[PDB]
Amino acid sequence: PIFLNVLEAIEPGVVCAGHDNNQPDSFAALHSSLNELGERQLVHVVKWAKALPGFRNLHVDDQMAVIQYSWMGLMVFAMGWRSFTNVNSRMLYFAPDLVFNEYRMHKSRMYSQCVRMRHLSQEFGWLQITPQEFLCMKALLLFSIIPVDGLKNQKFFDELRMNYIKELDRIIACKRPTSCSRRFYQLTKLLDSVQPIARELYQFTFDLLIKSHMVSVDFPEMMAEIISVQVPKILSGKVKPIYFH
Numbered sequence: 671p672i673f674l675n676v677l678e679a680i681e682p683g684v685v686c687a688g689h690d691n692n693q694p695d696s697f698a699a700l701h702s703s704l705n706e707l708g709e710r711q712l713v714h715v716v717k718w719a720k721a722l723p724g725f726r727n728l729h730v731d732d733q734m735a736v737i738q739y740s741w742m743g744l745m746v747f748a749m750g751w752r753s754f755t756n757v758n759s760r761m762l763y764f765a766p767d768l769v770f771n772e773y774r775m776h777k778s779r780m781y782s783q784c785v786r787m788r789h790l791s792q793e794f795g796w797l798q799i800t801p802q803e804f805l806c807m808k809a810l811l812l813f814s815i816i817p818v819d820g821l822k823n824q825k826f827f828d829e830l831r832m833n834y835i836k837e838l839d840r841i842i843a844c845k846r847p848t849s850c851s852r853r854f855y856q857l858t859k860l861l862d863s864v865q866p867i868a869r870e871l872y873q874f875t876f877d878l879l880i881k882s883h884m885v886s887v888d889f890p891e892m893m894a895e896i897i898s899v900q901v902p903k904i905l906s907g908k909v910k911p912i913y914f915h
């Protein structure tokens with residue numbers, strides 16, 4: 671099972687946010703820690719992506735592009751899995767030192783987005799997603815958002831994305847024909863549901879970056895760069911998700 675061997679081998683370990691839990695749960699402290707966690711997780715997402723089967727087949731400029739458009743969906747999907755496995759999904763397990771309860775959901779002023787993230791987390795339980803399904807679904811999320819004008823070499827991207835869809839298909843077929851088809855429908859519907867959630871968070875973090883000097887929220891360098899250079903291409907419609915349905 672070469673493909674799943676690789677996905678297990680490269681899956682990132684635990685990342686802490688560095689949050690001071692003795693602080694009061696203020697809007698500023700909570701988002702400053704979420705932003706630091708994003709910066710820390712971005713390092714791991716880059717190293718993970720570059721180690722995926724076939725990823726180096728992409729043009730080098732397309733490699734950075736797909737990471738810089740897919741990161742929010744990748745990290746929210748992984749956080750949903752962490753939450754499902756660690757607290758059976760009624761708190762958001764952003765990190766071992768940054769677990770959101772309903773109070774922090776409210777204080778962060780992103781309660782409705784947290785509710786949608788919690789619903790995504792719960793789907794791992796409702797659908798009884800296996801670790802292998804999770805790993806292959808998360809890899810596919812890296813290949814699920816691109817510029818409407820295409821990448822520098824779109825042909826190799828389309829081929830790579832095709833191959834990851836095939837791997838998802840194999841994972842479903844190894845498990846068990848009408849059940850295979852039902853499962854693939856369920857998993858592709860689940861994958862589609864990540865992008866609307868990521869879009870809402872992209873809108874929220876963009877607005878927060880613009881007003882960050884007035885609400886006392888710190889943005890690390892890579893986050894500030896990606897959210898001002900790449901995220902607005904998503905929000906203005908220059909970069910769009912690839913949906914199954």
Ligand SMILES: C[C@]12CCC(=O)C[C@@H]1CC[C@@H]1[C@@H]2CC[C@]2(C)[C@@H](O)CC[C@@H]12
Nearest residue numbers: 704705707708711745746749764871875
């Ligand atoms: C990706 C992160 C951080 C990593 C994670 O586990 C998911 C979580 C989802 C919300 C993001 C957060 C990074 C910082 C953001 C973008 C804040 O600015 C607003 C929403 C936060």
